[PDB]
Design a protein around this ligand. Sequence first.
Ligand SMILES: Cc1cn([C@H]2C[C@H](O)[C@@H](COP(=O)(O)OP(=O)(O)OP(=O)(O)O)O2)c(=O)[nH]c1=O
Ligand SMILES: Cc1cn([C@H]2C[C@H](O)[C@@H](COP(=O)(O)OP(=O)(O)OP(=O)(O)O)O2)c(=O)[nH]c1=O
Ligand SMILES: Cc1cn([C@H]2C[C@H](O)[C@@H](COP(=O)(O)OP(=O)(O)OP(=O)(O)O)O2)c(=O)[nH]c1=O
Ligand SMILES: Cc1cn([C@H]2C[C@H](O)[C@@H](COP(=O)(O)OP(=O)(O)OP(=O)(O)O)O2)c(=O)[nH]c1=O
Ligand SMILES: [Fe+2]
Ligand SMILES: [Fe+2]
Ligand SMILES: [Mg+2]
Ligand SMILES: [Mg+2]
Lengths: 559, 559
Amino acid sequence: SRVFPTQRDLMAGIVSKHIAKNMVPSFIMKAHESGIIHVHDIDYSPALPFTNCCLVDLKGMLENGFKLGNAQIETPKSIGVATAIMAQITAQVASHQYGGTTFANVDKVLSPYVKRTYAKHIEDAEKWQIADALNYAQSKTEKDVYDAFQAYEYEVNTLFSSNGQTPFVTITFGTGTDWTERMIQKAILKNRIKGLGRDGITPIFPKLVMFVEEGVNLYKDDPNYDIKQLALECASKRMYPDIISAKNNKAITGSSVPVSPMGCRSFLSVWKDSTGNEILDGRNNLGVVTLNLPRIALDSYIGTQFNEQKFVELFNERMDLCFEALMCRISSLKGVKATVAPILYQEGAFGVRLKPDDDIIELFKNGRSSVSLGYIGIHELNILVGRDIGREILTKMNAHLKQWTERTGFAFSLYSTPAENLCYRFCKLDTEKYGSVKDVTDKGWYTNSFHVSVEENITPFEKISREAPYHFIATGGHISYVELPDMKNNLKGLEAVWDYAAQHLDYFGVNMPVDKCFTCGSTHEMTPTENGFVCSICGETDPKKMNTIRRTCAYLGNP
Amino acid sequence: SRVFPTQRDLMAGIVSKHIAKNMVPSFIMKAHESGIIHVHDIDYSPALPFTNCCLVDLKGMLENGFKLGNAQIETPKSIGVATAIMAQITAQVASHQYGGTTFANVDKVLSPYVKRTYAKHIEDAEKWQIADALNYAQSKTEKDVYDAFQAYEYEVNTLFSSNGQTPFVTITFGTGTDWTERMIQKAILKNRIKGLGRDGITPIFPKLVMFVEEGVNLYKDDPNYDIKQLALECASKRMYPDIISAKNNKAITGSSVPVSPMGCRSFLSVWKDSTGNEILDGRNNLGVVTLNLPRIALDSYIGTQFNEQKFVELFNERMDLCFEALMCRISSLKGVKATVAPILYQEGAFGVRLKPDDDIIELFKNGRSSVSLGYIGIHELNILVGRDIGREILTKMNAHLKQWTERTGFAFSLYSTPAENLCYRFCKLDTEKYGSVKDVTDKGWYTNSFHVSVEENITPFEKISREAPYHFIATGGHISYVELPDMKNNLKGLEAVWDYAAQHLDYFGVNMPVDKCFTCGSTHEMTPTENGFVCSICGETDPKKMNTIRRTCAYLGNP
Ligand SMILES: Cc1cn([C@H]2C[C@H](O)[C@@H](COP(=O)(O)OP(=O)(O)OP(=O)(O)O)O2)c(=O)[nH]c1=O
Ligand SMILES: Cc1cn([C@H]2C[C@H](O)[C@@H](COP(=O)(O)OP(=O)(O)OP(=O)(O)O)O2)c(=O)[nH]c1=O
Ligand SMILES: Cc1cn([C@H]2C[C@H](O)[C@@H](COP(=O)(O)OP(=O)(O)OP(=O)(O)O)O2)c(=O)[nH]c1=O
Ligand SMILES: Cc1cn([C@H]2C[C@H](O)[C@@H](COP(=O)(O)OP(=O)(O)OP(=O)(O)O)O2)c(=O)[nH]c1=O
Ligand SMILES: [Fe+2]
Ligand SMILES: [Fe+2]
Ligand SMILES: [Mg+2]
Ligand SMILES: [Mg+2]
């Protein structure tokens, strides 16, 4: 885009790419340059000591106070101000890390402030002699909460003035049963269903993730079952939320509490502070280097046949390569001070408080921060090698990772790279060397991690059942998608899929069509044309006259 | 600063400086490089087609609606949402122009929404059977307005996450007499006096400018005289507001309405649209090129004496040079589309609505946009040439400018460059050539435009009387400062200066000391030390334990 903020960002990205070339060892760059591996965010790191994604310690920032500039902010006295502060923090964090930023359990964290808002409306009843003191406060408070999250949504939408790579913001909830916590959840979902602007279009951020759990909102008789239903409506109208099986999530992370994803789908593993406490909020990831799997197999061919021996040599060889690549950037952090990003290291953001001249690297050591080793297209890999080695190779990988972790003290993990673009980059480069290869590089892209090919036709239950096991292997990051027709009226159908998913896997999301004709008002699925979309019951063809959203890869977008 | 956002910005600035070198004619760069002239914002323009400062057409955006992303925003339904939208717009504009952004007459523009807030609190009275229906709404409404501007202040303070050169935001008011308009003004001033954070520190933005006018808030019996008093308190506690004599301002601008400054002190001249309407909000400036005056005189010396003849040759010579410099960047805009910055050209920002593929340059033609020709240090110039040629040379300049305007259709104007840094740059370069020169380059800087030297000791009335005439010559931009001791208790004294200023000149501001000891709580003037500030009644010496603000040059800062 020819928008100033974007233009400016590209300049800094070009200088950063160049600088990266003078910091990263030649053998690593060459590998990245040829498509064997992919050093993510090379346009940010290692030119500058940025970190990746994270879970913001909002709970700790609002309770203890923190500086935002020279201004010493104090605990919010109302829900509205709490979300306003949240938005303000979102802007800070977004400017100090190249990865996405997440606010986990906003329903449990903001809860206190929904109470303070109620408190006030009560005193206001015992001051103007309000009739239904209680029925009054419940009304106003309920509204306050609504406006607060509607304000948050526009704050985040405005942060597309930064365009220093769209601010990926994620917000999770669901594990709250109290009225306040319930009000927050509903407030969030109601705002989302409504949409943005007078045409109630579908927002692309902040991402929504709701935790489902037996005895909370899973079964018809659970306290928050009404929420689940609302959530179903939202997902059919707005695409999000996505759902996380608290059950499996906890098993995978080994955490006593559901673990929200940092950004799109990066998951931390349970960790404890010097006095034995399980800490989640405030933690982050250090970077991502993705291994091009199909390409390992392609390089293992001799003539037109696969050679198992060569494969193991290149695998072992490239595995060490990736380690080297990751350790290359973790080391660029050696020596940089907290003066580099105050909200993150000095105020509450990363859950601690460093002195300006403290080194930021010590904070990530000993398993606190996760480090990502990504991969892509097991599907194309299976084709290339004959059998299905998905689960097996991903396991051989975890093995390597464990040694890395034991040799460095850094929590290395298996991450299922969203690869929104890399899906193309890898294929293009591989094609420059092998050209069109049936089933592998012919379509022009590699399928995502362990996802079943976007072509293969299988029932949704067959699909979420085929991918489910990977969620327990690639602990660092994973998600499972399923394609469904309009379900706005068939919510039970959707609830069927959610339920089955919640049971077998961890991070689940179901993408279906979400269009709205601005002229005729139809929300039925548009009709695909060589020249764009056309409304079935209206004929509208002008793109400026409709809101057509689809989750092709990792995010929501308009084709 | 080693803060990521700043680091990133510098990268884009370095690429822009480099690019500028391949776009700007060699003779112009050489001149800029040697200190004869100064091409402002060379780190933004002309690498990218950015414009400078502006007056945002908030009134037009809120009334007619506009897009912020793909979201079609509608007229606010409350004051809180109006200021929230304002903040959101501030973020957009700030990211699409390198200059400061101003919101003129927020008291008259936001007024409608203060009414809608009242309206609602009334219906709420006729719904819960509120006792003092009116005394209730007046209470809540009055509070709503307060919170809205307190929210705005933190929004702007947070925009120091952009650090793509601190967002200079300016807000003006004063010309409003209605209750709503009055509530806004007071709300603004009350929030400012309070301060930011738990230590109520003095904010550096948004800048505050209040219009004073006979029969409004000038004399003891004017409707808003109580506001003026509050304003006096604020100025003594928080430094701002600054004041503008509506009387002189209108005479200078030739505008039927007080003309607020774009950013720090850029002033537009009256202009009309094709159907004869005086338009102010939505207009902007195209750039700034400053002429180094002392240096013209220095280059005019032969041996140790000034040579009048050489002076006129270099003056005429450099005048054309500056024109060339300004016309060089105005031409870089030739051909760029509105796709470059939607809030500015496509939505309401610049007061019109262009089609994506429309050229942005046509909008500034025929006097709509102002173009700045700056100057600096007439004081040092007077010394160098013997007599006082301040008023005379500034007039010979306007003459040149008028021909430029008649030859190009661009509204060229005489701008008194804030020169927050240039005051040093020019002196340093001039010194590389002439070294220490008594009274001129010895102290290490040149005084600002027509300002009486910061050393010369003269009564404030003598000073505002000596500088007053320049306000009517350098129409494009001007301001007059005066130094005063703590006046927090001597407000009448301050009001004395304001009154005299309001009478004789246009844009006036009085800077005095504004410190606060965090430990002892004292707000008396701190004591200067070779090692920093020390509290008189407390002894505190830790900088992290106090808020010491001073307006050394153009902005507020902590030495
Ligand atoms: C309004 C606002 C306040 N703050 C800060 C400032 C304070 O130190 C702290 C407390 O906010 P509040 O006390 O909630 O601010 P308020 O004046 O709107 O509410 P009340 O009248 O009930 O006091 O939060 C922000 O950080 N961002 C904001 O947008
Ligand atoms: C892979 C790739 C990325 N990019 C850009 C896009 C991003 O703004 C930036 C960051 O690099 P990546 O993180 O490599 O981009 P990605 O989208 O492949 O990674 P992911 O989807 O897993 O987040 O680089 C390209 O321009 N071309 C490419 O081929
Ligand atoms: C809250 C908010 C709304 N808007 C937009 C969205 C709408 O199109 C328009 C109108 O806002 P409002 O109608 O004032 O939004 P609200 O729902 O908080 O108030 P009410 O319950 O009285 O309706 O402003 C923003 O641009 N930024 C914001 O922060
Ligand atoms: C003059 C000068 C500016 N700059 C920087 C500061 C600004 O962020 C940026 C913009 O250039 P200028 O606009 O030239 O900076 P200035 O402060 O001299 O201009 P003014 O006070 O009138 O606004 O360049 C320097 O780093 N060194 C200098 O000597
Ligand atoms: Fe239609
Ligand atoms: Fe003190
Ligand atoms: Mg408060
Ligand atoms: Mg509304």
